[PDB]
Amino acid sequence: CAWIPAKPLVQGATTAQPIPGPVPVANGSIFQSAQPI
Amino acid sequence: ERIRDLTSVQGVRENSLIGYGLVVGLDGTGDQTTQTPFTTQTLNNMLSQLGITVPTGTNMQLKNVAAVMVTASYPPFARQGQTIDVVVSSMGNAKSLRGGTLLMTPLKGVDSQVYALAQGNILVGGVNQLNGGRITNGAIIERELPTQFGAGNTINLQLNDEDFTMAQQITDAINRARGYGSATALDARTVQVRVPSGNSSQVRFLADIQNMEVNVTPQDAKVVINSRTGSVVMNREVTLDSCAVAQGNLSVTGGSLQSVRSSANLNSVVRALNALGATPMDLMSILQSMQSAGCLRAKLEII
Amino acid sequence: ERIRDLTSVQGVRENSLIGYGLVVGLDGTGDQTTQTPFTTQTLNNMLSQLGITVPTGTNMQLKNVAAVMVTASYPPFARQGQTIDVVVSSMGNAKSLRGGTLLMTPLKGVDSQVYALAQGNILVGGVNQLNGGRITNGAIIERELPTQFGAGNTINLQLNDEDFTMAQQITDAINRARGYGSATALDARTVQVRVPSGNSSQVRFLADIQNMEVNVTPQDAKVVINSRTGSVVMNREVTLDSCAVAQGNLSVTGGSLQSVRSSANLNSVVRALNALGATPMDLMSILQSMQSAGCLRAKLEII
Amino acid sequence: ERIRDLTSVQGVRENSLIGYGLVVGLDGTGDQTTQTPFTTQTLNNMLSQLGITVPTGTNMQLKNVAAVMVTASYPPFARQGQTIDVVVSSMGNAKSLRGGTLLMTPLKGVDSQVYALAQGNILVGGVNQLNGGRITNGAIIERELPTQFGAGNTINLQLNDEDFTMAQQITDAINRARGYGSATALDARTVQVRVPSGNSSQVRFLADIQNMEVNVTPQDAKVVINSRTGSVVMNREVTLDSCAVAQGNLSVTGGSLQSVRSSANLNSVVRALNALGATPMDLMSILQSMQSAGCLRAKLEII
C-alpha cells in the first residue's frame, strides 16, 4: 500500500537556476540596472 | 571656456568606488579592537593570507591599527595603470589617523567589481579632522569601462542647470561657428550636436565646442537661505515691492513698522534691506514673510 | 617637459607590494606581545627556521621587538637586483620604532608572489610619528614582470586629467614635430601615437615625445574646499556675478547684507570676497550658498 | 662619475644575510631571561657544544647576556676570507648593548645557507640607541656565489630612476665614446651594451663606461611631502598657476583669501608660497588643495 504512486504536496521543481544577468550598456557608468519592475 | 563650464558631455562621467582597508602606523590612536571586532578579524585575515595563522582563541588588543573605509572617484576614460586620489575615513572608535599608512585596499564599484587598488600614506591636516585624510595618487586603476564614445553621429551636451533660453543660446552659438545644422536643442537641459563619424574626429569637434563662449542670459531670481549656517545669498535678478515690515526689537531710526522702498535692481534691494537694520537671523524671517505677502519678487529656496 | 608632466605612457606603471616583518633593536618600545600574539608567534617561527625550537608552552614577554607591515612600490621595468624604498608601519601597541632594524621581509604582490626582499635600518624623524618610518633602498627586487613594450606600432599617452582640448592639443603638438599622422586622439584622456617597430626605436621616439612643450589651455573653473583642513583654493577661471551675501556677525563696513561686485578675473574675485571680511570657515559656507544661488560661476568640489 | 651614480650593472648586486647570536659582556643590561627563554636555551646549547652540560631542570637568571639578531649585506663578487660590517639588534627586553661582544654567529641567506660568520665587539653611540650597534669588519665571508659575469656579449645597465629621455641619453653617450653600436636602450630603465667576449675585457669596458658623464635632462616635476616628519621638498621643475588660497588664521598682510601669482621657475614658486606666510604643516594642506584645484603643476607624492 506504500508502493502506490502518489503526488507530493509541493509539486513541481524544488529548485531554481539563477538566470544570467543582462549585458551592461556602454554608457560610461558602473551602475547598471536590469529591466526595472 | 563657457561651454565646458556650463555643460557636460554625454557618456563622459565619473563613477564612485568604495572599499575597506586597514591603516597601520598610528601612534596609539587606532581602534580599541575590543568594541570593533572587524578590525582584528580583518587583521587576522591579512596575516592568514600572508602566511601567519594566529590561533582562533586568543586576545589581540591593538593600538596602532584602524579599520577604515576608502572612497574614490573613477574618472572618465580611465585606463589601467593611472592613479587617482582617495579619501580615507575611520569606521570605529579610532582617535586619529595622523601618520598612518593605508594597506592594500581593493576599491569596488556598484557592481562589486574591483576597479582600483589603493595603498599609500595618509595626509591629515593637523579644529582639524583627525579621522579623515586624503591620499593623492593613492589608488591605481585596474579595470577599464567600455564606452560608446566615437560611435554614432550625435553627441549630447547636458546643461548643468535647466534653461530653455540657455539651451537655445548654446544651440545658436554652436550653429554659428560650426555650420548651419550642427546643433539642435532637445529639451531645457540637452543640446544634441551632429559630429563626424570616427573617434578622433569627435574629439577634435568637442575640443572646438568646449572652449566657445556663450553670453549667459538672465537666470531666474532666487534667494538662497541656509538656516543651518545662517547665510543669505541673493542673485542679481531679485526685486522688491513697496511694503511694510515689522519684527521684534527693530524700529525706524520712529515706530516698529518700517516701510521698504520698491526696488528694481540688486543694489536697491540691498540698500532697502539694510535700512531695516536686521541681523541675518532676523533677515531670514523677514524674507520668508515678504515672500508670503508678495513683496519679494524672487524664488525663496531653503538649503 | 610638458608632455611627461601631463601624460603617462601605457604599460609604464607602478605596482604596490606589501609584506609582514619584525623590527628589532628598539629601546624597550616594542609590542607588549601579551596582547599581540602574532609578534611572538612569528619570532618563534623565525627562530625555528634559524635552528632554535622554543618550547610550545612558555611565556615570552619581549620589549625590543615590534610586528610591522612593510609597503613599497614596484617601479616600471624593474629588474632583479635593483633597490627600492619601503615604508614600515607598526601593527600593534608599539610605542616607537626609533632605531629599529627591519629583518628579512618578503614583499608580496596582489598575486601573493614575492617580488622584493626587504631588510634595513628604519629612519624615524624625531609631533613626529614614532610608529612609522622609511628605509631608502631597503628592498631588493627579486622578480621581474613581462611587458609588451617594444611590441606593436601603437603607444597610448594617457592624460592625467581628462580634457578634449588638451588631448587635441597634444595630438597637434606631436603631429607638428614628428610627422603628419604620428598621433591620433582616441578620447578625452588618450592619445594614440604611431611608433616604429622595435624596442630601442620606441624608446627613442618616446624620449623625443616626453620633453615636448604644449601650451596648456584654460582648464575649467573650480573651487576646492577642504573642510577637514579648512582650506579654500580657487583657480584662475573662477568668476562671480553681482549678488548680495549675508552671514552671521558680518556687516558692511552698514547693514548685514553686503553686495558682491560681479567679477571677471581672479583678482576681482579675490578682492570682492575679501571685501566681505569673512573667515575661511565662513567663506566655505558663503561659497556653497553662492553656488546654490548662482553667483559663483565655478565648479565647487568638497575634498 | 655620472654613469656609475645613475645606473647599476646587471648581476652586480648585494644580498641580505641574517643570523641569530648572543652578546656577552654587558654591565647587567642584558635580558631578564625569565621572559625570554630562547636566551638561556641558546646559552645552554652553546655550553653543551663547548663541553658543559647544564642540568635540564635548573634556574639560570643571567644579566650580562642578550639574544640578538645580526643583519649584513653580502657584497657583489664577495670572496671567502673577506670581511663585512654587521648590524646587531637586541631581540627581547634588554636594556643596552653598550660594551658587549658578539659571539660566533652564522649569517644565513634566504636559502638558509651560511654565507658569513660574525663575531666582534659592538660599537654603540653613547638620545642614542642602546639596543642597536654596528661591528665594522665583524663578519667573514665563508661562501661564494657563482655568477655569469664575463659570459656573453651583452651587459645591462639598469637606471635607478626610469626615464626614456635618460635611457636614450645614456645610449647616445655610450655610443659616442665607445663606437657606433655599443649600446641600445631596451626600455625606460635598461640600456643594453655590447661587450667583448671574455672576463677582463668586460671589466675594462665597464671601467671605461662607469666614469663617463651624461648631461642629466629635466626630470619631472614633483613635490614630496613627508607628514610623519613634517617636511616638504620641491624640485626645480615645479610651477604654479594664478589662484586664490584661503586657510585658517592666514590673511593678506587684508582678507583671508590671498592671491598666489602664476610662477614659472622654482624661485618664483618659493616667493609666491612664502608670501602666504604658511607654516609647513599648513603648507602641506595648501599644496594638496592646490593639486586638487589645479594650480600646482607638479606631481604630489606623500612619503
From Swiss-Prot, chain A:
Lipid anchor positions (N-palmitoyl cysteine): 1
Subcellular location: Cell outer membrane; Bacterial flagellum basal body
Residues where lipid is bound covalently (S-diacylglycerol cysteine): 1
Subunit annotation: The basal body constitutes a major portion of the flagellar organelle and consists of four rings (L,P,S, and M) mounted on a central rod.
Purpose of the protein: Assembles around the rod to form the L-ring and probably protects the motor/basal body from shearing forces during rotation.
Family affiliation: Belongs to the FlgH family.
Protein name (database record): Flagellar L-ring protein
Gene this chain is encoded by: flgH
Span within the parent record: 22 to 58 of 232
Swiss-Prot record, chains B, C, D:
Function recorded in the entry: Assembles around the rod to form the L-ring and probably protects the motor/basal body from shearing forces during rotation.
Annotated GO MF terms: structural molecule activity
GO cellular component, one term: outer membrane-bounded periplasmic space
Keyword Signal appears in the UniProt entry: yes
Keywords associated with the record: Bacterial flagellum, Periplasm, Signal
UniProt xrefs under InterPro entries: Flag_FlgI (IPR001782)
Subunit structure as annotated in this protein's UniProt entry: The basal body constitutes a major portion of the flagellar organelle and consists of four rings (L,P,S, and M) mounted on a central rod.
Cellular location(s): Periplasm; Bacterial flagellum basal body
Family (UniProt): Belongs to the FlgI family.
Main localization (coarse): periplasm
GO biological process, one term: bacterial-type flagellum-dependent cell motility
Protein name as catalogued: Flagellar P-ring protein
Family matches, as NCBIfam families: PRK05303.1
